[PDB]
Amino acid sequence: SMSYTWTGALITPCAAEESKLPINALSNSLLRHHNMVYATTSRSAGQRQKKVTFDRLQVLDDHYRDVLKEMKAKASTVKAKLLSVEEACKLTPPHSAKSKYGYGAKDVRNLSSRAVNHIHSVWKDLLEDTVTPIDTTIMAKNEVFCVQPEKGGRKPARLIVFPDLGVRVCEKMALYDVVSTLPQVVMGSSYGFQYSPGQRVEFLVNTWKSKKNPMGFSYDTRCFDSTVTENDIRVEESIYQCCDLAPEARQAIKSLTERLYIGGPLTNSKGQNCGYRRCRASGVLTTSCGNTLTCYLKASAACRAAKLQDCTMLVNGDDLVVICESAGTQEDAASLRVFTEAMTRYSAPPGDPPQPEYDLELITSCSSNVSVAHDASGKRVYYLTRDPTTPLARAAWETARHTPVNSWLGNIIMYAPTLWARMILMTHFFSILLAQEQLEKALDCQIYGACYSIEPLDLPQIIERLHGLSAFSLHSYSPGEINRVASCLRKLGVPPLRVWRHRARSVRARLLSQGGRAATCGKYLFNWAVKTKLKLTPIPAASQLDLSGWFVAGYSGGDIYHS
C-alpha cells in the first residue's frame, strides 16, 4: 500500500525556523565557514514527503518465518509490567509537546488532576475502543548539518509524526517495560543499545577477530520507516504479546497497535488534515524497539538467503552491520547482491548498495567506527569515534543559539576518548561555561534517544566510569583518524591544534584556580594540554554514579526523560 497519502495541506511550522548559522563572535572562534552550516526547516518538507511516499511490496518466505518463530520463542520468556500513571508521568520530558486538551508537560510531571483525569480517560478509551485511528501531528524536524559538496545537494528536513501528550503517557504505561527489556532478550548480543561506546567497540573487535578472513558490511535501507508495512507492525505486536502481560496491558497494546502504530490521519500545526500514514510513526514509544526488531528479523532471514558464512549482526533501530567469513572478492560481492535482493522482497530495499569491507576501522555503523590510540602506559586502546563534522556544526549552532537539547554535551560523554571531543568540544564549551559562570548549571542532552539532565562539572566521573581513566590520556591517534579530523577542520574553517592547546591551557588554569569540582575538570579533562602532566588517579566520585539504564535500550522518538 502507499506509505503516505497527502491531501495537499502543507507541513507547517509553529515558530520561526532559522536555516543559516547566525554570525556570532563565539561560534566564529569555533569555525569560520558559517555558510557551510545549515538547519533544515519545513521549507524542505515537500522534498522529504516525495521521497518517503511510495508503494510497498512485500513477499515473505520460510527463512523469514523461521527467524520470526525463533524470535517469538525468546519473547515468550519475558514478563513485563504496566507502568502506573505516576511512573509514566515521571518519564515525561519537562518540555515535551503539550496536550491539546488544556495541559502540558509541567502539568503531567506535577500530576495535576486535569492532566491525570485526561490520562485516565485516554487509557479507559484505549481499553474500550480498539479500532478508531488516533490523530497524530506531523512536523518537519529542524536539524543542523554541514554542506556535503560530494553529495550534490543538502538534506531536506526529516518528518516527525507523534500522538497527543495524553496518548504518549499511556504508551509508557502499557509498553515502557516491554520496549526496555524485550529487545535484548530476543536479539541477545546483536541488540546494539545494550552497549556503551566502549562495549560496542569490544563486541565489534572480538567479533572481527573471531573470523579467519573477516569481511563486514553495513546495510542502508532507503527510508526504513516508510518501508515498515502493516504486516511488520502486526508481527511486532505478536512478539510483544508473547510476553507474560497483565490483561490490561494486552488490550492496551492491541489497541495502540490498531489505532496508532499501524497508521492514522496526519494533522499539521494549522490543524489541517495532511493525509494518512500506513508505515512506522517516527515519534512513538515503540519506534526504536520496533525498528530494531524488524530490521533484525529481515536481516537475519536475508543472511540465510545469501548463505553468509558464520555471520554476526549488530542492529540499532534501522542501523545494521554484519561481520562474517569472507569467501573471496567476487563471491562477497555476489553474496551482498543476494542479501540485498532478499531485503528488498521483505520490503527493506537499499539506499546505498552494501559493499564488502576488509578493514574494521573503515566500517561505519551508527555513524561510528572503531579506532585505536595509546594510553599513558603506551598500550593500545580501541575506542569509538566518528567523523566530527555534524558534531562540530551542531556545536557551532548551539553556541550561537539557545538549544533545548545540547548535543555537544551528549557528544562529549559518548566520544570522550576522541581527539576532536577533547581538543575542541571540551575546550570550547568549558571556556563559555567559565565566561558565563555556568559550570553548575545542569543541561539536557540525549543518549540513545532518552533525555538526561547532566551537570558539566560531573563530566570527569562520568567519563571515567564510561571510558575509564585512559580517556584522559590517549595520544598517538591513528593516521587515518588524524587525517579525517584535519580534513574536517579545514572544510569548516576550525582553528588548529596549536590554537586549541593554547586555549585549553587558559581554560585549565582558570578551572584549577577555582578549586572544587571545577579544579578536577581542569585537571582531568585538560591534562593533555600541558607539558608537565598531573597524575590522574581514580576519581572517588566515579564509583557512586547511577550509570545503569544509560545503555539498556533505545528510545529515539519515544519522548523519554531520565532523572
Ligand SMILES: Cc1cc(SC2=C(O)C[C@@](CCc3ccc(O)cc3)(C3CCCC3)OC2=O)c(C(C)(C)C)cc1N
Ligand atoms: C601525551 C602525548 C601526546 C603526544 S602528541 C598528542 C596526541 O597524540 C593527541 C593530541 C593531538 C591530536 C591531534 C593530532 C593532529 C591534529 O591536527 C590535531 C590533533 C590530542 C589529545 C587530546 C586533544 C588533542 O594531543 C597531543 O599533544 C605524543 C606523541 C608521541 C604523538 C607526539 C606522545 C604523548 N605521550
